[PDB]
Structure formats: C-alpha cells, structure tokens
Design a protein around this ligand. Structure first.
Ligand SMILES: [Mg+2]
Length: 221
DNA sequence: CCTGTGACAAATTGCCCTCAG
DNA sequence: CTGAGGGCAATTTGTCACAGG
C-alpha cells in the first residue's frame, strides 16, 4: 500500500546531503507535488499521518519533523550536463495549527520533479522505510533507476562519482575505510530491510579500485 | 604506494518523562 | 487523548595511528 514514489532521474542523481529523517520527508512532498499541476508549491505535513506511515510515536515523530526542518536552512542541491546549484526552501516552515506544518518549496524545482516522460525512476515507499542509514537510501534510490520490470538489473558505478553525488565524508577517500563504514554497511542494510538481493564486485585498474559493479535480484523469486 | 584493524571522538538511534491544552 | 519540550544510554558513524605486502 505505500504510495508509488515517482522521481526524475535528475533527482535520483544529484548532489546533496540530507539526513535520514529529511530524505524521508523528501519522498512525501514530491507525492503532493505529483497531485499538483501552474502550481503554488506549498505542502502540508500531518504529524499523525507521519507516525502512521513510518510507524512512529506521536511524540518522537514531532521531534523528527522539527529538527529536520530547522536543518533545511543551509541545505543545497547541485544539478548536472551542468553545475547549477539550488536551494531547498525560500521561507522557513511553520505550523498555523497544532500538528500541521506548511513548507514552501522553491518552485524552480517543480519541473525537475516531474522531469521527462522519457527517463525517470520509480519505486514504492514500502521498499525503503526500514533503512536507518541515508547513504543506503541514495543507493537503492539509484539502483532502482536501472531496474527492469521483473525486479532485477545490473550497474557499474565509479567511486569519484559516488563521492560527489551522494556527498560523503572526506575521510572515505581511503578505500580501507570506504569499504568499512560505507560499502559493507549499505549493502547489509539493503539486503536485510528491503525486498532486494544484492552483491558486488570491485573494478580495478592498476593499483587502485575505481568502480563497483552492483548486481541484484528481486528477492521475490 | 596498497591495504585491514583498533581506538578515540563525535553524531545518531530509539526510548523515557514533563506539561499545556 | 495529542503533540511541543527536555533528557538519555547504546550503537552506529567518522577519523586516524600502526603493521605488513
Ligand atoms: Mg526520532
């Protein structure tokens, strides 16, 4: 039953750092954007509906959905084919009434959310909601960019490019760490908490790894 | 140069309780 | 009963020294 989340490939591949909680909210606006046209670009958020859709308590849910908002100040996203740096909101959010929050999306993002009828990413929210780690979030998010209908696919990604688009810590430049605190972690989270069955092999030129080749079956078979 | 691992610091997790309405 | 607050211990995340190929 989770609402199918349908995003521009543009989005799937862009450069931003958002928290777990924050990306969670990301999925929710773009849905309200999808029932929008010729838009105003304002979005409502209902605390009760959050803690039902993400299995939280009323009280904890209202922490997650407050802090996150304050830490959208500053947050940007860079678009590429291009070096076009954008910003998430224009006025901060607020709650006219008890429980509802009205955010104000930069309406110069609307077409970058509908993108193109040619190339776009889809998935259902049910897949992703038991992920704690966000980097795991971006990955499954891209991994779906390539899924063919039966739930399977293949892809090679390049380390210099994962670092940019997903915008990871500088200390991960050394691979020994990269594979410890990002690689084995995000493959373990996905292959545990989602309906996907992953594995990986490294692509090495010379004395250095450079690509990761991701390869996945829908666990449903 | 490459790597893996330990140890320490700094940020998250979910869980707890107060209080106003 | 709800949600706007304060606080938390345990684990998960970011860093870097050191040992060997
Ligand atoms: Mg929380």
């Amino acid at each position: 039953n989770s609402p199918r989340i349908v995003q521009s490939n543009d989005l799937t591949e862009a450069a931003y750092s958002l928290s777990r909680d924050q990306k969670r909210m990301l999925y929710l606006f773009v849905d309200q954007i999808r029932k929008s046209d010729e838009h105003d670009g304002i979005c409502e958020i209902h605390v009760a509906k959050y803690a039902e859709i993400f299995g939280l308590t009323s009280a904890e849910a209202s922490k997650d959905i407050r802090q996150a908002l304050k830490s959208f100040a500053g947050k940007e996203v860079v678009f590429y084919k291009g070096y076009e740096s954008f910003p998430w909101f224009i006025k901060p959010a607020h709650s006219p009434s008890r429980g509802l929050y009205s955010v104000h999306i930069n309406p110069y993002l609307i077409p970058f959310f509908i993108g193109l009828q040619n190339r776009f990413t889809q998935f259902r929210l049910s897949e992703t909601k038991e992920i704690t780690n966000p980097y795991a979030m971006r990955l499954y998010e891209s991994l779906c960019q390539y899924r063919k209908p039966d739930g399977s696919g293949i892809v090679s990604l390049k380390i210099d490019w994962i670092i940019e688009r997903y915008q990871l810590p500088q200390s991960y430049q050394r691979m020994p760490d990269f594979r410890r605190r990002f690689l084995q972690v995000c493959v373990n989270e996905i292959n545990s908490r989602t309906p996907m069955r992953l594995s990986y092999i490294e692509k090495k030129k010379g004395r250095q790894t450079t690509h990761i080749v991701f390869s996945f079956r829908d666990i449903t078979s």
